[PDB]
Protein: LanC-like protein 2
Organism: Homo sapiens
Amino acid sequence: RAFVNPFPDYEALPFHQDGKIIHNFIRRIQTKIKDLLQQMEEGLKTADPHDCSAYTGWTGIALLYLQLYRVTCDQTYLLRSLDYVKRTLRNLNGRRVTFLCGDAGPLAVGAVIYHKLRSDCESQECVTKLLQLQRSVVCQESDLPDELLYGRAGYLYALLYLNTEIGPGTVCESAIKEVVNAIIESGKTLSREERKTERCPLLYQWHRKQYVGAAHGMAGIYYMLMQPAAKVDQETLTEMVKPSIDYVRHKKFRSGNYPSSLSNETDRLVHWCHGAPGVIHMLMQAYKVFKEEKYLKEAMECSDVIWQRGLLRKGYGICHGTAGNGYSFLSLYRLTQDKKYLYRACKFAEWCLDYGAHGCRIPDRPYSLFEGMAGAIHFLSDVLGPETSRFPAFEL
Ligand SMILES: [Zn+2]
């Protein structure tokens, strides 16, 4: 599942003492980005015309070019992002709600792109249509899950995306509070039916499995609830979210990895979607909000599991691959300024410079943001500037 990580750890260099990446490594990274960009452009020509998702479709490619534009300021990239959103803005049936897999991705990415190209009316039309998803999400009688790829938390992300990328006052805080309350009541309900009201106040399941991790599980729901832009009150944070965070912490393996769901006792997946590379963001965010060192210390422990098991044979992607796990190191570095994690991110990036020379399997969507090439390009573009790195479709 993982390669043997060949690199020595930081103690046993691709940056200077002050944290700045050396010229040679920047140049090697920018060279590969150009290289991979052209392979991605070529392969997307045969990709599925209908998958418009941020996760595996066209909206994800526009997200990459938005990201390229954020970090280079090259207007060429802004314009190219428009080429990819435009594919996605016409078919919308409003049956999927999340930023990653539903209509909120095309719509929120489109609204941001239009706003940076100064056309306010198309920008506003996107936002207006996005908010029409509101009732389907807030309805407690809907079978809709709460998790990030198909549930309330993924819709919540789109709103926070608008208020952080465009600005506060794009989405009404009333509409964010409604979605937050819907998520909270959902977690109270299931936790009562499972008689966990006092041990895990907020409990969630997806397809009747109580997933632990970022993509479909509790760690990603708690992570969004802890976002400063979701404006959750102190009482709900300390009485409802923190004890739920602590409950999942105590389900961790002795190996330091985290299970895929509460029942599963076999330690296999070291992915953003399942395992320590996703749960670590819950812990790091828990450290930002609650400021107790045990949360950071556990994030550091997650980092060591990811350093040893995180170079994956699945591939180089964000969801379950080397780029997504490499982001764990950039995030922890931003939090700690401990250049050990800068080093570890730099080494995973080095692995990505050899993209496709390792005998990794080919993902179904091999050019996509979260399954394929676009995500690796995304991750490489952020190692250039570790201080401003953002995990796509997840950090704000
Ligand atoms: Zn995955």
